[PDB]
Amino acid sequence: AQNPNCNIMIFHPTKEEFNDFDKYIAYMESQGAHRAGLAKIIPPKEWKARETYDNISEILIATPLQQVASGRAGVFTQYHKKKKAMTVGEYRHLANSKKYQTPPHQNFEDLERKYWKNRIYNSPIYGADISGSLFDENTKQWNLGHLGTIQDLLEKECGVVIEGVNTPYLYFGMWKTTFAWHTEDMDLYSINYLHLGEPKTWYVVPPEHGQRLERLARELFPGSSRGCGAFLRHKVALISPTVLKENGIPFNRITQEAGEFMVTFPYGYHAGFNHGFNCAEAINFATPRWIDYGKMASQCSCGEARVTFSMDAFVRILQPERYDLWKRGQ
């Protein structure tokens, strides 16, 4: 079996290998990449996402979110407090101000130590899930706005015809901006491109051990767990690497730099944080291997995890027994 220890693998495709997205995902899986839950792809040197990031400051962040924590340094939840709209220009200036700027630090390890020690005592602000794309129209390989849609995959594999669209989203982050432990909706894949700015650190649990993380989260967040079996889909819970190690949870970590793609695989739980001002783009996608994960994915039906209208058809076709209850929760 390939990649039995479930290590995060890093790939360096040639321009020739970068010309067929689904073929290269399948190649990475033939080498065991999916067993880690996450892989890094470094594009060939000749490729570029866009020629210049001039004027990015004109994009509007309609509802910036302030991430307020509760709990202890290694085990906390975060809630989002809505802020007034700001442009990316205003947001970048805020990210770089004394209150929010990255602190002096020796290396990535020192910065990670500072994050887990101090995150709960600050409330960083970020822009999340902004529909849009920063790829140039003339970028033909790995353009997240021109990938095959999840609907077309489902129609090809199952012979069904469904409504819905699949479009990319932008994220603007700053030091300590945090993404909570989660898998994707319907346990889909995701792909994330870091367009500009400072790095993003990722943590990931192998899909074959995802239930261990779920059991620990129930133990550590008992009130939250009681409302909803699938409360990790609320995307509110953080658990540090030290606490994961104390409790025997298998995981890995890797840092993504500007110009690099990260792919998350079906049922790979992930979390992480930004080092400083940056801009990323992400979209969900599917392959034939995803279908059996989609059929078995847990659902939040308690109200909290309000989803996209695209997800209705996925539940309706793949999980008919669950559909009515899930709908009541929407």
Ligand SMILES: O=C(NCCCN1CCOCC1)c1cc(-c2nn[nH]n2)ccn1
């Ligand atoms: O999957 C993630 N977020 C949830 C997407 C919600 N769906 C459903 C609603 O429409 C947008 C897509 C995520 C975010 C980040 C991240 N990177 N920088 N900040 N956060 C990293 C890894 N995963």
Ligand SMILES: [Cl-]
């Ligand atoms: Cl700090």
Ligand code: NI
């Ligand atoms: Ni994600």
Ligand SMILES: [Zn+2]
């Ligand atoms: Zn719920």
